[PDB]
Ligand binder design. Structure first.
Ligand SMILES: O=C(O)c1cc(=O)[nH]c(=O)n1[C@@H]1O[C@H](COP(=O)(O)O)[C@@H](O)[C@H]1O
Ligand SMILES: O=C(O)c1cc(=O)[nH]c(=O)n1[C@@H]1O[C@H](COP(=O)(O)O)[C@@H](O)[C@H]1O
Lengths: 256, 256
């Protein structure tokens, strides 16, 4: 098993994955903050304070009450300053012809500011083809949703295998997965795992939690995605540091 | 098999489905226009001219370059004038806690103007639970995506059966399906079918077309969803009338 720094140099590595893996090793962080807030001021204050602790900031641009492309300009300034990627968790899931417009255009112009986006594989490979026609020219990457954290997820068995095949057949653009575990045996592919908290539990709408030690250490994922475990805490900086140290040590102990 | 007008009166019918079925029978239309345009002025000019020919106008609010809630105010005026429902084809596909915010909030405030939305079933029933916590109080309906039109779709076999079970267990909010065919044997549930053109063919990004006669007449669906077959035509009114007459006669001939 290679370190993040060595994976950053693999011959078939995507440039976006390489950039991410380099800053993960430099900063000793495999934490992605899920910045699930409705106010631009809170998003930017979290990005600035937690920037040093995170490899990635995950957005849902469509829950931000005061979105403007200028807010995303300020977010890019912080991403460059503190060295993290921006991941818009848009979960594209339409025919190729539709998703290309949803990615490039409308009010959000996601491709103009998002290093990474993600897509569901249920529509077939056209979803990836459509996205890549915008994303390849704009030097972007994509994650495929191979497994989900929620109760009753149908992303199991042959579905997960189809996501892995689709990623591997589109390595020019697909840099990894949303998954609960290592699903690809190819080390060029990032595994990002949501549904993470230090304590056992869930929410009232089907979210299920596992610990950083379980998903990084036992299940072999690379990056934890954490929302409420940080966002709902009083001291979001110390919460982020707890999650960072947990995920980083789990990673180191799997390396041996 | 019951007429649309008789289905509108079924004991377990959802009010949104009833409203739709009534205006389908009154206007002799089972055509949903896929208004896949980037300009508000073109969206509103299509809604006004084609309003009399359609039971429903399907939006992708996130490809509209000049979206404002005022554009949707003008669209509602046309929907009320000409009697059609507004369907935002958002394809919600996240955990319940996320989709409730994506449905109610952000810039688009989808639930404030959309009669109908749709959701993927891959995350499990939490996606429906989250949406229904916004949509039930706002007297809205939802369609579940049971089958897709695109090449390589994984929405087959047990997946389609899971979508039908989920719809039937959430009949307070779920009024039907995006599907290629009749998937539910319960007549209270609408079947809407995209991937429709009069001529054989497809697009370059995995879209596949079938005719109105095939999907309404042979496959037993209720409503055709048509984008480019109308939108790319020179005379979009006559194109809409051709699709309306095709879908309506296919429906009548299945009734006998
Ligand atoms: O793509 C994702 O990040 C995602 C996939 C998934 O399987 N589960 C999942 O929870 N998410 C997202 O990750 C975040 C989880 O947030 P918390 O439950 O607050 O930690 C939310 O923004 C979800 O939308
Ligand atoms: O939910 C949908 O409407 C949808 C589901 C699906 O399986 N296939 C599909 O084509 N659609 C949508 O229906 C429209 C099809 O447009 P045309 O291919 O131009 O007729 C697009 O806006 C798609 O996003």
């Amino acid at each position: 098993e290679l370190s993040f720094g060595a994976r950053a140099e693999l011959p078939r590595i995507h440039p976006v994955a390489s950039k991410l893996l380099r800053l993960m090793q430099k900063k000793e962080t495999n934490l992605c903050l899920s910045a699930d807030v409705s106010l631009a001021r809170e998003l930017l204050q979290l990005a600035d304070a937690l920037g040093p602790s995170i490899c990635m900031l995950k957005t849902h641009v469509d829950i931000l009450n005061d979105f403007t492309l200028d807010v995303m300009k300020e977010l890019i300034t912080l991403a460059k300053c503190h060295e993290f990627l921006i991941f818009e968790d848009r979960k594209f899931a339409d025919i190729g012809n539709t998703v290309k417009k949803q990615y490039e255009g409308g009010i959000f112009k996601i491709a103009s500011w998002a290093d990474l986006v993600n897509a569901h594989v249920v529509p077939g490979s056209g979803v990836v083809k459509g996205l890549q026609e915008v994303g390849l020219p704009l030097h972007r990457g994509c994650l495929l949703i191979a497994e989900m954290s929620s109760t009753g997820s149908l992303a199991t068995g042959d579905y997960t295998r189809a996501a892995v095949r689709m990623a591997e057949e589109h390595s020019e653009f697909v840099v990894g997965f949303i998954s609960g575990s290592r699903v690809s045996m190819k080390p060029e592919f990032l595994h990002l795992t949501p549904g993470v908290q230090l304590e056992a539990g869930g929410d009232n709408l089907g979210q299920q939690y596992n610990s950083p030690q379980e998903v990084i250490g036992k299940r072999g994922s690379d990056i934890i995605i954490v929302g409420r475990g940080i966002i709902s805490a009083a001291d979001r900086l110390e919460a982020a540091e707890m999650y960072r140290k947990a995920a980083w040590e789990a990673y180191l102990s799997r390396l041996g």
